[PDB]
Every structure is written in structure tokens, then in C-alpha cells.
Scaffold this active site. Structure first.
Site, PDB file in Angstrom:
ATOM      1  N   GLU A   1       0.841  -1.223   0.000  1.00 42.04           N
ATOM      2  CA  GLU A   1       0.000   0.000   0.000  1.00 42.04           C
ATOM      3  C   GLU A   1       0.865   1.257   0.000  1.00 42.04           C
ATOM      4  O   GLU A   1       0.567   2.338   0.588  1.00 42.04           O
ATOM      5  CB  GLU A   1      -1.009  -0.063   1.140  1.00 42.04           C
TER       6      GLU A   1
ATOM      7  N   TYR B   1      -6.193   4.129  -9.304  1.00 39.72           N
ATOM      8  CA  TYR B   1      -5.564   3.990  -7.985  1.00 39.72           C
ATOM      9  C   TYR B   1      -4.355   3.103  -8.142  1.00 39.72           C
ATOM     10  O   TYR B   1      -4.591   2.027  -8.766  1.00 39.72           O
ATOM     11  CB  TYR B   1      -6.757   3.477  -7.131  1.00 39.72           C
TER      12      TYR B   1
ATOM     13  N   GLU C   1      -0.389   1.419  -6.415  1.00 36.11           N
ATOM     14  CA  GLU C   1       0.476   1.151  -5.278  1.00 36.11           C
ATOM     15  C   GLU C   1       1.781   0.476  -5.712  1.00 36.11           C
ATOM     16  O   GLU C   1       1.730  -0.269  -6.711  1.00 36.11           O
ATOM     17  CB  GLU C   1      -0.085   0.119  -4.265  1.00 36.11           C
TER      18      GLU C   1
ATOM     19  N   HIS D   1      -0.587  -7.943  -2.913  1.00 39.93           N
ATOM     20  CA  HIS D   1      -1.592  -7.152  -2.139  1.00 39.93           C
ATOM     21  C   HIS D   1      -2.864  -7.366  -3.013  1.00 39.93           C
ATOM     22  O   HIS D   1      -2.997  -6.644  -4.053  1.00 39.93           O
ATOM     23  CB  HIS D   1      -1.334  -5.674  -1.910  1.00 39.93           C
TER      24      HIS D   1
ATOM     25  N   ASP E   1      -0.878  -9.070   1.924  1.00 34.03           N
ATOM     26  CA  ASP E   1      -2.283  -8.878   2.322  1.00 34.03           C
ATOM     27  C   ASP E   1      -3.164  -9.513   1.192  1.00 34.03           C
ATOM     28  O   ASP E   1      -3.526  -8.829   0.266  1.00 34.03           O
ATOM     29  CB  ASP E   1      -2.628  -7.439   2.566  1.00 34.03           C
TER      30      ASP E   1
ATOM     31  N   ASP F   1      -3.826 -11.272   6.121  1.00 32.86           N
ATOM     32  CA  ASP F   1      -2.375 -11.323   5.824  1.00 32.86           C
ATOM     33  C   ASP F   1      -1.857 -12.762   5.953  1.00 32.86           C
ATOM     34  O   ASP F   1      -2.067 -13.350   6.997  1.00 32.86           O
ATOM     35  CB  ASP F   1      -1.667 -10.310   6.712  1.00 32.86           C
TER      36      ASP F   1
ATOM     37  N   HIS G   1      -3.852  -3.069   9.760  1.00 33.79           N
ATOM     38  CA  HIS G   1      -3.297  -4.402   9.661  1.00 33.79           C
ATOM     39  C   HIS G   1      -2.063  -4.586  10.546  1.00 33.79           C
ATOM     40  O   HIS G   1      -1.266  -3.681  10.682  1.00 33.79           O
ATOM     41  CB  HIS G   1      -2.827  -4.747   8.219  1.00 33.79           C
TER      42      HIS G   1
END
Ligand SMILES: *[C@@H]1O[C@H](CO)[C@@H](O[C@@H]2O[C@H](CO)[C@@H](O[C@@H]3O[C@H](CO[C@H]4O[C@H](CO[C@@H]5O[C@H](CO)[C@@H](O)[C@H](O)[C@@H]5O)[C@@H](O)[C@@H](O)[C@@H]4O)[C@@H](O)[C@H](O[C@@H]4O[C@H](CO[C@H]5O[C@H](CO)[C@H](O)[C@H](O)[C@H]5O)[C@@H](O)[C@H](O)[C@@H]4O)[C@@H]3O)[C@H](O)[C@H]2NC(C)=O)[C@H](O)[C@H]1NC(C)=O
Ligand SMILES: *[C@@H]1O[C@H](CO)[C@@H](O[C@@H]2O[C@H](CO)[C@@H](O[C@@H]3O[C@H](CO[C@H]4O[C@H](CO[C@@H]5O[C@H](CO)[C@@H](O)[C@H](O)[C@@H]5O)[C@@H](O)[C@@H](O)[C@@H]4O)[C@@H](O)[C@H](O[C@@H]4O[C@H](CO[C@H]5O[C@H](CO)[C@H](O)[C@H](O)[C@H]5O)[C@@H](O)[C@H](O)[C@@H]4O)[C@@H]3O)[C@H](O)[C@H]2NC(C)=O)[C@H](O)[C@H]1NC(C)=O
Ligand code: CA
Ligand code: CA
Ligand code: CA
Ligand code: CA
Lengths: 258, 258
Positions: free
Chosen positions: B39, B76, B78, B132, B166, B210, B250
Site C-alpha cells: 500500500e 488507484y 500502489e 496485495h 495482504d 495477511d 493491519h
């Protein structure tokens, strides 16, 4: 424990009815605790029954067996026959791989799968996947065995699996640049015991058609190093080429487990 | 060797600019030899650079890193950030998994893959696959990691691979009856170190989002039994819920190799 996969050209009634031929076949078989027989052309199980007659002639429990249904896509059909010594090994379970089907099925002769119990060896449980590939479709077929492995893992939760048979894995059928296409080869999960330089044919060709592949660290630790090899029966018995050929055009491939 | 995967909610400039927040992040990171950060919302690497500032403030070689490009399908994006102590481990190779692409790509954030050299442990070479997942597509994504494993095997010829991150692998995202659909779970090639009953979220939910998965007998033999667990930093530092939450929602998941 001594295991072999043997493609006996046109194994059937005519062949088993020849006592000289039958005699050598018995001989070969008796060298092993487990033997996979391919190219069983025997719709009514007459040949299979003649062979068992011979094997169990002295003790009704010398050898037990598992036979598949006659398999094939066109009209030509073959069975997978597994012979085993019940005093050495035990059958825990068996299933026929579900490939589809028409147009969609991935194999001419979908693999028969057998799970064995072996108390004398390091590995106590393992599965054997049998494959007699279609020459024409060798690459596709060997590649699909990667999917079979998965299916075995999903069903029995076992990683210890031996994949064996006449894969037609050399020469015209699987050429040099085609190995890339085979997941059963590019995945390091699998160890190929019979190398590309081995000769598994009784005729004058030099091709490693017959193979033995293993997955599973327990099973891989159980193979006796350098035991995996084709059994040249011609050399062994001092047979003539025409006599060796009347038995089969392939040598059995064997391996020893400890 | 101590390895962790940590999803730091909205890791970026704003967050790293808070010295109190930055301070705890550094603290957490320093517990490990290898840490996967997820993230990372940092198009221009400002946040990543602020973090390295802190980590290497006393020695320019405290931590080295590998960062992926900003990944995502919509708008979006990451990055995957791997931090590692160069005195413990070394990067042998890295690659971004090629998923396709639009309409066809299998992942929102295709896995970054890194091969490490570890002299202090049983396993001397292994790869880490970072993921992720997209909540919405968790099942599909985790299932596709089976294909990534294969890709790694084909490329490096290595069986020793740790898959982590994750995965959103519980609660609403991967329900009870959906585990059947995941090859990474039904294949016994893989061992899941973080169990379904573990709580990897800092909020009030009880979900094992996770995870840490390993394939390879050498790597599997190297895991210290019972070391795999989420790191509850709230408990560890005696933080308030609002303070624990400002760090992340997390917990990091860690494992120790020997
Ligand atoms: C199960 O399996 C095995 C493995 O598959 C089988 O063994 C193989 O079998 C055969 C025979 O069935 C044998 O093949 C060869 O075939 C010829 C056949 O005859 C040829 O010639 C005929 C006339 O020609 C004369 O023959 C002389 C030799 O061939 C020749 O030199 C002379 O000048 C003439 O030309 C003709 O009929 C043809 O069309 C043929 O091509 C065999 O003769 C050859 O070996 C010879 O054997 C005979 C013995 O046979 C005779 O005697 C008894 C008693 O009367 C018989 O009844 C026969 O009917 C007779 O012919 C000798 O007289 C010769 O001197 C001669 O050298 C040769 O065998 C294989 O090679 C053999 N292979 C192995 C390695 O075993 C077996 O068939 C199977 N099981 C059973 C039988 O069904
Ligand atoms: C980086 O990260 C951390 C973690 O994210 C950050 O820490 C968190 O930060 C905040 C504050 O920024 C703090 O939040 C709470 O917020 C209120 C804000 O004020 C409220 O009330 C205002 C007027 O109401 C009066 O206030 C009394 C208490 O709130 C009240 O009971 C009284 O009757 C009145 O209502 C109004 O402005 C609002 O809209 C607000 O909701 C904080 O006051 C509260 O704690 C209190 O703190 C003050 C101290 O602040 C004053 O003094 C210095 C010097 O002049 C300042 O300049 C401030 O400008 C002043 O207000 C005391 O006077 C009180 O007695 C009181 O109890 C509380 O802090 C967090 O809880 C905190 N969390 C943690 C766990 O650290 C941090 O922001 C980040 N970094 C940086 C700053 O940017
Ligand atoms: Ca078929
Ligand atoms: Ca040959
Ligand atoms: Ca993608
Ligand atoms: Ca929780």
C-alpha cells in the site's frame, strides 16, 4: 521395491497363446514387485486372464491386479494393467482421470491412477500415474500430466507421485525445441529418472520413449541412485532380434525404491 | 532470519511526514532482516526516500531496497517495497510478473518477485512473491498465485518460494466454501504458515487477511516452528486504539528462518 512400466506390443490373446512368448513375458514380469502393462488389446480380458493363470499357477496370491476399462477416442482401444505382489504392496485407492468428453478430452488414453501402501520403503504411500501417449499428440499429453498431478494432490493430498509409461518422449514425437512446451518438464517439482539419452526401444532406433518421472521429496529420497534404467531383455537372454521383437519393440523401464 | 509482510495503510508522504508515526514505522521495520511493504501510495518516491533517510541515518548501508513501478488497473496505484539488510541477505534477481494487458490481466497489482541469497540459513536461495490482492477479486487472485509459482519455477528453476502479503484471505473476501476454488490452497505443494484462525487486523474485526505460504522442502525445513505469526504492535507498545489505527489497520505477519 522394484517397479517397471512395460509396453508389450499388441498384448493380447494371440500373443499370450504362444507358450514361448508367454514364457518370456512371465519371466520379465516376475522381476518386479509392481508392473504397469500397456497396449493391452483385450476387450474381453481373455489375455489378462491367461497371464494371471501363469503368474498365480503355484500360489493364487502371487500377483493381484487393477485393470482399467478399454480406453481410446477413435475405435482402437487399450487397457492399463497394473500387476503387483500383495505381500509387498497394497492398493489403497484407484481412479480413472476424468479428462472431459466429444472434441474436448485431453488424452487418447486418460491416465489410470493407483495409490499404493509400501511398508518396506521410506515412502509408505505413493501414487502411480500411467500414460501410454498418442504419438501424434505426445507433447500435449505429456504437458497435461501436469494437470493430473494437481488432480492427485487435490484428491489424496499426496505429493509423492510416480508418472510412468510409454510417453513417446523422443525422436519424431517430442523434438528438441518442444520440451519448452511441457510443464511436466519445465517445472522443477519433477525429476526425470530416465534421461533423454536412454534407449528404451527393442528396434534399431535410439529413442527414450519410455519414462519415469517422480514428484515428492519422500519418494525422491526413496529412489536408489542409478537404478532407473530400461531393461534390455535381448541382451539379458541372448535373444535374436526377431525373437526380441516378437516380445515387444520396447524395453521395460524400471527403478528400485528403498 | 526474520521476515515480515506489512500493509501500511496509505503509506505515503502525509504519513511519513508525521515524526511520531514515522518513528513507530521505523521501529517495526528494524525488527526484520527482510520486510515487504504494501500500500505504498508514492508516485514520486518521496515517502520511500523519507523512510530510507531514517533507516540509514547512521550507516548508509543499514537497509537496501527494491521497489516496483506503481501498479493498478483503474486509476488507484500502489508499489511493492522490499527493504532488506545487506549484511544478512543479497538480491540475486528480480522481475515483475507479466499477467497480460486491456480486459485480460489476472491481477490488479501483479506480483513483484525477488530472489534472495541467505548465507545464515538452511535454504541458501529462495524467492519471495508479493501480493496485495483486490478485496473484490481475492479468490481469483490467490488462485492465480499458483500460476506465478510455476512461472518462478520455469525462470529460476527454484522450488523454494515464499508467497506473502495482504491477500484479504478471510471474512467477506474469501468465505468458507470458496477455498475449494484456490489451487494455492488445494495443492499440498504449499504450506500455509498463518492459519485461518489468526487475527492480522489492527481494528475490531477478527480476520486472517495477511498470509505467509511456502513451497520447497529446503525452505519448509528452514521455518522455525511456531514463529509464523502476526505482530500485534498495539499490545507490544501499549498503544491506544486510535494511535494503533493511525499506523495501520493491519498487523505485520512475520516468520523466522533458521
Ligand atoms: C511362437 O513364437 C515364436 C516367435 O514368434 C515362433 O518361432 C518362429 O517360427 C518359425 C516357424 O513357424 C521360424 O521361421 C522360419 O520359417 C521357415 C518356414 O519355412 C520356409 O520354407 C518353406 C519351404 O522352404 C524350404 O525350407 C528351408 C528352410 O526355411 C529352405 O532353406 C529349403 O531350401 C526350402 O526353401 C516354406 O514353407 C516357406 O514359405 C518358409 O518361408 C522355417 O523352416 C525356418 O526354419 C527351418 O525349420 C525347419 C523345421 O520345420 C519342419 O519340421 C517340422 C516337422 O515336420 C514341421 O512340421 C514343419 O512343418 C517343417 O517345416 C527345418 O526343416 C529347416 O532345416 C529350417 O531351417 C524358420 O523357422 C522361426 O525362425 C521361429 N523363431 C524363433 C526365433 O523361434 C513360433 O512360430 C510361435 N509358435 C507356434 C509355432 O505357433
Ligand atoms: C501525528 O500523529 C498523531 C497520531 O495521528 C497525532 O496526535 C493526535 O492529535 C490530536 C491533536 O491534533 C489529539 O486529538 C484530540 O483533539 C483535541 C482538539 O481539540 C478539540 O477541542 C477544541 C476546543 O474544545 C475544547 O477542548 C477541550 C479538549 O479537547 C475540551 O474538553 C474543552 O471543553 C473544549 O471543548 C476544538 O478545537 C476542536 O474542534 C477539537 O475537537 C485535543 O485538544 C485533545 O486533547 C487536548 O489537548 C490540549 C492541548 O492542545 C492545546 O495546546 C497547544 C498550545 O497552545 C496547542 O497549540 C493546541 O493548539 C491546543 O489546543 C489540551 O489543552 C486539552 O486539555 C485536551 O485534553 C486531543 O489531543 C490526539 O488525541 C492525538 N493522538 C495521539 C494518541 O497522539 C498528531 O496530530 C500528528 N502530528 C502533528 C501534530 O501534526
Ligand atoms: Ca480420453
Ligand atoms: Ca533401440
Ligand atoms: Ca495488473
Ligand atoms: Ca483484529
Amino acid at each position: 521395491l522394484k517397479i517397471a512400466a512395460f509396453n508389450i506390443r499388441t498384448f493380447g490373446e494371440t500373443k499370450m497363446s504362444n507358450a514361448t512368448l508367454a514364457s518370456y513375458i512371465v519371466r520379465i514380469v516376475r522381476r518386479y514387485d509392481i508392473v504397469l502393462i500397456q497396449e493391452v488389446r483385450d476387450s474381453h480380458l481373455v489375455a489378462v486372464g491367461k497371464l494371471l493363470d501363469y503368474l498365480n499357477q503355484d500360489d493364487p496370491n502371487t500377483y493381484h491386479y487393477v485393470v482399467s476399462e478399454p480406453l481410446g477416442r477413435n475405435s482402437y482401444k487399450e487397457r492399463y494393467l497394473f500387476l503387483f505382489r500383495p505381500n509387498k504392496v497394497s492398493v489403497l485407492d484407484t481412479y480413472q482421470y476424468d479428462d472431459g468428453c466429444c472434441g474436448n478430452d485431453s488424452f487418447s488414453r486418460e491416465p489410470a491412477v493407483v495409490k499404493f501402501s509400501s511398508h518396506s520403503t521410506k515412502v509408505k504411500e505413493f501414487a502411480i500415474v500411467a500414460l501410454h501417449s498418442a504419438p501424434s499428440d505426445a507433447v500435449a499429453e505429456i504437458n497435461s500430466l501436469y494437470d493430473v498431478y494437481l488432480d492427485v494432490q487435490q484428491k489424496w493430498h499426496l505429493n509423492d507421485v510416480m508418472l510412468m509409461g510409454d510417453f513417446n518422449a523422443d525422436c519424431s514425437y517430442v523434438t528438441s525445441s518442444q520440451w519448452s512446451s511441457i510443464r511436466l518438464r519445465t517445472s522443477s517439482t519433477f525429476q526425470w529418472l530416465i534421461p533423454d539419452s536412454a534407449d528404451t526401444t527393442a528396434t534399431s532406433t535410439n529413442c527414450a520413449y519410455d519414462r519415469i518421472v517422480v514428484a515428492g521429496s519422500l519418494l525422491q529420497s526413496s529412489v536408489v541412485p542409478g537404478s532407473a534404467a530400461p531393461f534390455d531383455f535381448q541382451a539379458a537372454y541372448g535373444l535374436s532380434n526377431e525373437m526380441a521383437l516378437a516380445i515387444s519393440d520396447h524395453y521395460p523401464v524400471e527403478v528400485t525404491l528403498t
